[PDB]
Scaffold this active site. Sequence first.
Site: not given
Ligand SMILES: Cc1ncc(COP(=O)(O)O)c(CNCCCCN)c1O
Lengths: 381, 378
Positions: A50, A171, A248
């Site tokens: 994502k 997370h 992740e």
């Molecule tokens: C459940 C979950 N797992 C991984 C990530 C990746 O986070 P990152 O800080 O390493 O890139 C997420 C991210 N969630 C929301 C991102 C919003 C950015 N405006 C996640 O929910």
Amino acid sequence: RFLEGFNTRDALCKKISGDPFFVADLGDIVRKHETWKKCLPRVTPFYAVKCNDDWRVLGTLAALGTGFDCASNTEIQRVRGIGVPPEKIIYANPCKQISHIRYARDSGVDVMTFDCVDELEKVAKTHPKAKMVLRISTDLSVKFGAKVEDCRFILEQAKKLNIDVTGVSFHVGSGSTDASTFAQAISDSRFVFDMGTELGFNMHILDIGGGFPGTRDAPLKFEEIAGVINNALEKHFPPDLKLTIVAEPGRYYVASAFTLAVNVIAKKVTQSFMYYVNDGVYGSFNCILYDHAVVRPLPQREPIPNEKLYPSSVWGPTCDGLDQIVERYYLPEMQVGEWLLFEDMGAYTVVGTSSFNGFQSPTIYYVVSGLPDHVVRELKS
Amino acid sequence: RFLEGFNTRDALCKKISGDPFFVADLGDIVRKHETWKKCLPRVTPFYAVKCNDDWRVLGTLAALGTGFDCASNTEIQRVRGIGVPPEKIIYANPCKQISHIRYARDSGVDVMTFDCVDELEKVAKTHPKAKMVLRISTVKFGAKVEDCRFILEQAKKLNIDVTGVSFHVGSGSTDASTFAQAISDSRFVFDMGTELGFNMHILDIGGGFPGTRDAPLKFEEIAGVINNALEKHFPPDLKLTIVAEPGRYYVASAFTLAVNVIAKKVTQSFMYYVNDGVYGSFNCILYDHAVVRPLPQREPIPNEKLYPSSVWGPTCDGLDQIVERYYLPEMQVGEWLLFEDMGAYTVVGTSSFNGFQSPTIYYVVSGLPDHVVRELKS
Ligand SMILES: Cc1ncc(COP(=O)(O)O)c(CNCCCCN)c1O
Ligand SMILES: Cc1ncc(COP(=O)(O)O)c(CNCCCCN)c1O
């Protein structure tokens, strides 16, 4: 596409000869991976698609051997599309649409997360044999993550639904100014992990999520976080052949790999200036509204000794008065047609773009290194 | 495409018997136009395409004889594509990319706006004969009245054909006096232009008119204030053309969004997760300051119990939230929630974050004789 000069900035200058564009250094991703293995050798990364789903970015992480954390049927299809096996995919969305659950099952994807009983009722009816990972809260917390004091009940219900619970995840997010959050989460995870084993579940997965910095500049360094994480791991999850630790990371891998080049399309003088560029909050800079990003404009022009600098504002293309990128930053006098650069624009940028006002998102160009010839040839196809 | 039904609701019910979808009543657009012609007979509307560029919406407005306000080469290409002549198009973006100005020129589009001298320097080099409209302030756009003389003097030096004045008060008005003030200010600039010898014959009063017949400040009250100001400062004259750039006015209430409850959590309150959110159709909550109200598509039952509830988008973002605390009857996964008045600044600002696809658009057309035939046959 792919250009040369083995430095993202030389490739960018060489390129410059008025549409906005990205230069993505696939080689920076390789380096980030080397640092991950060195600082978190016990943790297998499942890249959060994502964050940035560019095909070259996915092909690169795939050849480096990472897994992929997918959030929808579209992302699973994208990852399976480049030939990645379902075992290297985790469906880490706690609240999934039934038809998407059905798509994962039909695609061979079996590990998914959940954080409440309602989700288990769905899995029971749709993907009964799925290996479920229970996501706990880290007090984003209002939206996802079961509270520790609710996990016993949740696991009991899972037993009644005959659900194959196999791990715990959490997370912390990227808004931490202290790695201690990871330590506390890993401790809570041990408590829930033991509760599962107690109830007869085959607990073998610990998923530590994302939130790691993607720019080697941030206050809280990646190395300090890896240290705090490793210590909590040593204390609560000693090495064991039946245990696999995964994460992740999303921004960690790509934040700094993308540099954006926008063109100054209009200018107003008032002693300050207002520059309008051809990308904005509805395009690449949506990260400013949705990801709380702060950007810094960099003139592409080579500096001239004692140039005068002036308080300036930078605006996006759009009719929207709120489509503003920079409020008051010191820049030398720019001319229409010149370029402004924005570094560290690889995370939560291209994935949140819209075509409001009819403007098109910037085309992505690539420079690469640290990869075998056969892999590059796949990236170029 | 077109759905069987006599109503939006009727069509919805038909279709429902789990991807989110839109039902757009092209008939609601026809009625908005009739009301426009009735309350603002002196003003020709140029639909702000940016608000919602759905192909059927544009084709309908076109058949109704409206003009179009375009902001980029892409929108000009789209309006020209459905057969609209360049004269019914106004390039209303004050700060245009050079290749885009060049495109408009090559497309026969000559009326463009500007709000500073730098933009004129560009026009002189790329579209020297364009008919330029000076946009005044009501901080991103708009020249201050005090600065217009200097700007007009520079336009003469650049040999620019300045033909009018425009303004945009925006949607944030609690008082229609804002339109009167802007019209008065436009008179001052109109006169400075005539005095410098320019052929000033266009007054563009912009947009900002409400699109939902419920808002506090009603369209009719605004029209009245605009008409009185227009009579006082811009008396009827065959050489004078008054235009507007309404956007939400024409499409806000035409679209109804139907989303599916894909997950639920109980805490006595509920949390529902739907398959559209702030990165999709509800980006309007962040970008357009919109407030939405979820409506159970389910036919009510006598004294159902109602509980405080929150509605969330399908994304991993904890900020992807639609409703904070709204009273709804207990919903079940698979049931549908409707959102009315979702036509303005919704489908245009959507992104495919997390891989979710934007809702498909279906059409119906109520309250209209078999004119329905004309519109469905485009
Ligand atoms: C459940 C979950 N797992 C991984 C990530 C990746 O986070 P990152 O800080 O390493 O890139 C997420 C991210 N969630 C929301 C991102 C919003 C950015 N405006 C996640 O929910
Ligand atoms: C110059 C100009 N002309 C028309 C419109 C349409 O406004 P509306 O209220 O009638 O739809 C605009 C609006 N621009 C920004 C809309 C942002 C929505 N979040 C305009 O600038």
